[PDB]
Subunit: 180 residues, 2 copies
């Protein structure tokens, strides 16, 4: 029943398309963080190294993990992990983080629906799973998607906690509303 066409389109839209949107949204969130820092004469370094708990990754790390979730998630679903761009996680500044987002966005632009032809059924096994696997469809739904939103939300929470006036519209972004 054309199931390959549906599975591939959905998985493409959930990952390449929606993850690119959310990463752009994360960029917009940082525009508010810069406005705050300027207005409150807060050092951006302080925000970038802030965190919600002493044993939880800081803001720089949340951004890095969000980007990796999108990048590696797509690489994995499309069977292209060996071709994926590598990042050493050396970023310490907002500029560098904006570059990291931009790179992942460019990477994601390179894919099409057809790259996901067999994504639903591909066997994904991470190094710490002792050979056990999830199908690509399961991995998207239960692993990659929750994780992407977890780390973007936690980045948002760090900023919000520090006083940045980011709101839900900044996280969701524009909707493709249609006139009736």
């Amino acid at each position: 029943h054309h199931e390959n066409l549906y599975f591939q389109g959905m998985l493409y839209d959930l990952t390449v398309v929606q993850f690119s949107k959310m990463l752009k949204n994360l960029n917009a969130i940082f525009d508010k963080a810069e406005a705050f820092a300027e207005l409150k004469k807060v050092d951006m370094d302080v925000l970038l190294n802030s965190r919600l708990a002493a044993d939880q990754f800081n803001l720089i790390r949340q951004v890095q993990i969000a980007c990796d979730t999108a990048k590696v998630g797509v690489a994995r679903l499309t069977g292209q992990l060996e071709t994926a761009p590598k990042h050493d996680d050396s970023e310490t500044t907002l500029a560098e983080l904006r570059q990291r987002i931009a790179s992942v966005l460019t990477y994601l632009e390179g894919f099409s629906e057809a790259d996901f032809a067999n994504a639903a059924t591909i066997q994904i096994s991470q190094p710490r799973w002792q050979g056990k696997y999830l199908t690509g469809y399961e991995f998207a739904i239960e692993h990659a998607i929750p994780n992407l939103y977890f780390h973007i939300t936690t980045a948002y929470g760090i900023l919000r906690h520090n006083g940045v006036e980011v709101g839900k519209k900044d996280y969701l972004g524009a909707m493709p509303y249609k006139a009736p």
Copy 2:
């Protein structure tokens, strides 16, 4: 069949999993409260910013996101559980999670027959609409993870020993056979 099963899995099934996960997270909050001699009401009223909604509200909103999301996608707006946000206790919030889990259990893949293409318009949208496909991907899903992660973060910030595994829940791991 087409997007019916996929939209059902993305919403009914995975949101159910996540709410079950949220319930389990509160088991850890209870452990913490007893061990650290912290009153649960303290945690329920905690927040990440003075002007952001507190834990109770994050839980209420995550439930309503799942509930109303599925109601809208399936076009079944005539009857759904009505909650009034009167909950002040953990017992009450667990009843609210249970209520939505029960509601979501009543749906099948067939209820999503036209969810991809249904037009969805909220009251504040001025007649403007999204397709159910767009609504699920761009609105419902992100909103559900937002509020659950924020609830997690409030607990985590206050010292509750939750980790990523509590948030994701169990994975359907399989052993390779070919």
